[PDB]
Nucleic acid binder design. Structure first.
Ligand code: R8U
Ligand code: R8U
Ligand code: MN
Ligand code: MN
Ligand code: MN
Ligand code: NA
Lengths: 482, 189, 481, 189
DNA sequence: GGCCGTACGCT
DNA sequence: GAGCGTAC
DNA sequence: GGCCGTACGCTT
DNA sequence: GAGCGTAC
């Protein structure tokens, strides 16, 4: 049976758990900004043909697919992550399009997965774009039965776009979401200047942009975040003071801070009132509706200073909150604390690689296709001999051999001739082959241009980024006040 | 768990008896919180026509409604303690939703009969199809079933109490034979 | 609008009652299945979960059956499938499960996340020839799938595995039987339309519970097979044996069908505590995955163990009745049937299935024969074929030229245009000629079957017999007296 | 609760600590009931090296173990009362099952240290599959991990307390920094 | 269908 | 009369 | 991962 | 604080 040491058991077994949580559960890769469960869900939606045009699919079956295929964990770990990706108060750029009940800011969960359906969002397709053009490196899944991607092409800078929170072992992460327009502009600036300072980059990227909007007090917390990877940022709700009639006033809250549960936050304010720990509040009403949007109302007692009641609610409730920036991501499969430029750098590099690989892959396929078309041309030009040769032959092997000797055709070219359908012999068809060959030759030339010059490839990256910004970039939601 | 409305005015308020917790959750977001209260029902509810009164009374589901309606029951019913002028049954447009109906209407006709005659009881009509209430969005549940401006509630009436007694007794009674005969007399395969 | 309560009550209840009856609680008399079962099996089929292929996560199976066919709670789907995998539940189990699938002690199965299944070899027999126009398909709930109205069911599954279900206004309770005896009874029936229940009972002795046991008497079985309603006394297999030192014990090794062993054991222990049964000193379950069911009742020295046994019969579920109420769906109507009606309806189903299959294979042979006739002509006159194509500027033109010049159907002509060049080599030409000749013998064989009503029937009896030989097993339940 | 060994005799009786309820249930149906008891653990248990003693003594999992071992804890620990001579750690062959393994050993080391010396504490060798303990058969679990015949056990051995003290505090302690550094220094990617 | 335990880092 | 098995 | 509600009929 | 979000 044999023995085992306890100090050695603790170190080995603990180091296995830790690295695993670090590199394969809790932290996002710098390139696509995804944790494993996220990457697998989106890839799963991709391998099931769950694109925006297609109909919704039961969440039960999505999760079940991702579970048995790529993600050998409990199902609620999958489903809940997929539900996060589907909420517009969670994701600055939602990655899942859900149908049914998928929760609210009041912290009410989503219905169980048998009550819901899902599919990709249109912005998600950008994460998956060109995944099938040898752009990223695939690997074997757990049961060695499937293949799954190591990273997505991620045609937009998704780590900063949606941000990350994740508790590892020995470290955690916290990256706030950003405005996609400002983020891409940043990349475009960096692309035409490898030596840009954070100070300059900040002229594109003003700072976080939360889905739940609200205010951020001061640019100083943001600057410390962007230069070092760590800094505290001050999130304040959007509240105003207005009259309610009879010379009395109320506070009206319309945007609450990020990741703050609305329900809980209101119950806190209520507590401070029973406990008599704040003065001047007569009523607390949640008037939020699907048509009004968020609206918490706090009725102030007559001849109490509302502005003073407000500044105390900031100090005393989650009406004002901190976002503790701690930008840790996987960089070359290792956790690194990165600053803004480091993040943007690892991303643009990725795009160059993705686009280079795609252009390379396209060239292999065009060059391979042109080769067949040359053989088909030859065959159609010498068709009567071609046919004779085949009928004369007793086997493929023999027919292959003759065709290759008579016309000097490659093995692949001959194979393509034998596979040809009779209908390709009509007069119209021959001319089509000519066109396709001509178009291909143009294409091959364009592709060689891109690979020949690093500058041209990079401009193409710039141009494809500029299209995403034009199609998907939106206005900043969160106001940054000084 | 009941999620009450803002106004305590019975005259202007309405209660939705919803089938299932997932539909409970959906309903609470989509509603107008100032005038619409929601009390989920977890599945099939006690068939009072078959049960013993001690059981009928100590039943969570059956009780929770007494509280919410707050009007007492049986001999002790007060037409005027009612906390809602509209009692709406909201069930799936499928056979199980229709069974939960027959179960609720059995409950009312036996324990809160004055309430129906008052015309306080109404049957919603959610979109017809293969989608249950739990499976819908909160905005689609509002705009199609709950919104006063585009809803088609069916108020419940009783012309006859004698034929209504033999009906609740034949369909929901514990004599299976009367029930079995009604099917064979009425079934269209 | 406004609505009358007596009208609403009558229509709501009738909607529900009818549905539970014809689409939930009662089995169809042909394949012995209720909707949820039919769907789990048809699901396993569509997802390619065949006995050779490896086991698939139960969650994914349940999810697909729920998304495509059965729009109900996940739990109602999984627990039905779990039942179909238990050898103490199904006389001939339909699902082959890997993982924890429960036991006699009423311990449930592990959640579906933790179990894998595929179909059993016998389930292949339920789905045999499903895709040969043997049974009518129908639209599902979301109108996005087709589902079988009934399965081909190439063995008599209603009686084999039995059925129990609570409907509305009725319920059903049909016991399992021995497959060898049922098939012997269907063959008997197939050679004598006027056979009595009594003569059929010479093949089908009585029920055959997966849990074995003893049935006391034949008269309950006779009343059930003759009216469709009846009571059957099932008794445990207990013996009395010396345990050493003059002392004795009762060893129970088989329990009644549908009896929770655990609950039964606690029931005895509770009688012993409350001093309401005399003479028992110990109660141990010595049942292992290796020894079989073994419940030992130790008996205090010099007590009468035969009296204790009799009293354990009187007070515990060590003796239990099974109450037969053979109500199945017959032309999608609920109907009380006897042994013969059950086997009559089954044989008919098997005839229509073998007919429809033969009828479908014939059409597909004629179709393919016609194509090969087309290809043969082309091979014959290949030079001219090539010409007529080459001299056409569009495939549409070639299609019409080809049909005119060689008197080909539109289908024959399209087939020829599709034909790749490699099909002109020596061997590829020979394969065509060889296919055609084998195909013509086949058509003559099929038309033989469809030419005589008796050849069709003998083929039915032959395919039943084959199933009986591969799948039939020994009786488990002893029928005493 | 724990399913106990029919045998009364501590000398011959073994307890399996099984990760998860599905694995527990299957284990019960598979084990030789004469000498093998089964105490399931619902997921991760408490990290005592970070918890104060009041929380520790209130933990269900921790309390079920103390009970079952019946040997008291800390100062009040007496080997003589031990109800099993073999205590087995049976977890999945995954990183999580290794986490739970390090948790249980933390508890043993800090509370039942005496027991480790006595080497009653063992670690099962389940199939190093892709599968976990909850996805196996009882007969698969029986003859691979449990059958006293064809099974292999790692008996846990302590051989330097000063080394063990520093290690349990660095790995399972509340200071994250030192833990971050041991990861930084020994992790090979 | 919901209700509930734990680890892990950070503020 | 009690717990069988599909439903919410 | 388990715990628990309810309807529904039944052995002449 | 206790709760952010992947795990059992
Ligand atoms: C496997 C479970 C069984 N069910 C139980 C229900 C209720 C209870 C239940 N209850 C209880 O004991 O007190 C309150 C409630 C009546 N304990 O265990 C239960 C279910 F398993 C009703 C049920 C539910 O949980 N939620 C629904 O909205 N709809 C349903 O049909 C239903 C659910 C859908 O499925
Ligand atoms: C979504 C749930 C969360 N879990 C809970 C656990 C435990 C509890 C739990 N309790 C517990 O552990 O002791 C006291 C209290 C009853 N309450 O709620 C829980 C889960 F949701 C541990 C869990 C389980 O339920 N059983 C397992 O075998 N393994 C697991 O990982 C786990 C399960 C697998 O998944
Ligand atoms: Mn429904
Ligand atoms: Mn000819
Ligand atoms: Mn595991
Ligand atoms: Na605050």
């Amino acid at each position: 049976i044999n023995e085992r040491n306890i100090t050695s058991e603790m170190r080995e077994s603990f180091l296995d758990y830790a690295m695993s949580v670090i590199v394969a559960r809790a932290l996002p890769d710098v390139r696509d900004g995804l944790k494993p469960v996220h990457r697998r869900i989106l890839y799963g939606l991709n391998e099931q043909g769950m694109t925006p045009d297609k109909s919704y699919k039961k969440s039960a079956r999505i999760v079940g697919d991702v579970m048995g295929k790529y993600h050998p964990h409990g199902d609620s770990s999958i489903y809940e992550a997929m539900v996060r990706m589907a909420q517009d108060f969670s994701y600055r750029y939602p990655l899942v399009d859900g149908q049914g009940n998928f929760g609210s800011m009041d912290g009410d969960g989503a219905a169980a997965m048998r009550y819901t359906e899902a599919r990709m969002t249109k912005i998600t397709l950008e994460l998956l774009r060109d995944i099938n053009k040898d752009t990223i490196d695939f690997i074997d899944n757990y049961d060695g039965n499937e293949r799954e991607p190591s990273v997505l092409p991620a045609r937009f800078p998704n780590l900063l776009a949606n941000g990350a929170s994740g508790i590892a072992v020995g470290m955690a992460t916290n990256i706030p979401p950003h405005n996609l327009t400002e983020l891409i502009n940043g990349v475009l600036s960096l692309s035409k200047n490898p030596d840009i300072s954070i100070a300059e980059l900040m002229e594109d990227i003003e700072g976080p942009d939360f889905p739940t909007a609200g205010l951020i007090l001061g640019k100083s917390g943001i600057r410390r975040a962007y230069e070092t990877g760590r800094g505290s940022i001050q999130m304040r709700s959007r509240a105003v003071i207005e009259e309610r009639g009879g010379g009395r006033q109320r506070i009206v809250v319309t945007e609450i801070p990020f990741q703050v549960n609305k329900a809980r936050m209101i119950e806190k304010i209520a507590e401070l009132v029973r406990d008599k720990k704040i003065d001047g509040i007569t009523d607390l009403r949640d008037e939020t509706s699907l048509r009004t949007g968020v609206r918490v109302v706090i009725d102030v007692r007559k001849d109490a200073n509302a502005s003073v009641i407000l500044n105390n609610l900031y100090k005393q409730t989650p009406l004002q909150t901190s976002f503790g920036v701690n930008m840790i991501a996987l960089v070359n499969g290792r956790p690194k604390l990165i600053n803004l430029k480091e993040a943007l750098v690892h991303y643009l590099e990725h795009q160059k690689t993705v686009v280079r690989r795609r252009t390379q892959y396209n060239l292999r396929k065009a060059k391979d296709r042109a080769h067949i078309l040359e053989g088909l041309r030859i065959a159609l030009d010498h068709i009567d001999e071609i046919i004779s040769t085949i009928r004369e032959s007793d086997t493929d092997k023999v027919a292959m051999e003759s065709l290759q000797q008579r016309f000097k055709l490659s093995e692949k070219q001959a194979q393509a001739i034998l596979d040809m359908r009779l209908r390709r012999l009509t007069g119209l068809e021959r001319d089509k082959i000519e066109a396709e060959y001509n178009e291909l030759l143009n294409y091959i030339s364009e592709l060689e241009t891109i690979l020949a010059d690093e500058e041209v490839l990079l401009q193409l990256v710039r141009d494809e980024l500029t299209e995403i910004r034009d199609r998907f970039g939106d206005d900043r939601r969160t106001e940054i006040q000084l | 768990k009941l999620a009450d409305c803002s106004s305590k005015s019975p005259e202007e308020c309405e209660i939705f008896l919803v089938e299932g917790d997932s539909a409970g959750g959906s309903t609470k977001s989509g509603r107008d919180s100032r005038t619409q209260a929601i009390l989920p029902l977890r599945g099939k509810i006690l068939n009072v026509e078959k049960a013993r009164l001690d059981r009928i009374l100590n039943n969570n589901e059956i009780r929770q409604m007494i509280t919410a309606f707050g009007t007492g029951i049986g001999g002790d019913f007060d037409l005027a303690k009612a906390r809602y002028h509209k009692i709406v049954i909201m069930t799936d447009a499928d056979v199980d939703g229709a069974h939960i109906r027959t179960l609720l209407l059995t409950f009312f006709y036996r324990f809160m009969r004055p309430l129906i005659e008052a015309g306080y009881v109404y049957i919603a009509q959610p979109p017809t199809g293969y989608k249950g209430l739990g499976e819908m969005n909160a905005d689609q549940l509002w705009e199609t079933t709950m919104n006063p401006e585009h809803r088609a509630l069916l108020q419940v009436k009783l012309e006859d109490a004698i034929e209504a007694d033999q009906t609740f007794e034949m369909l929901m009674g514990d004599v299976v034979e009367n029930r079995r005969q009604f099917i064979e007399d009425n079934a269209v395969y």
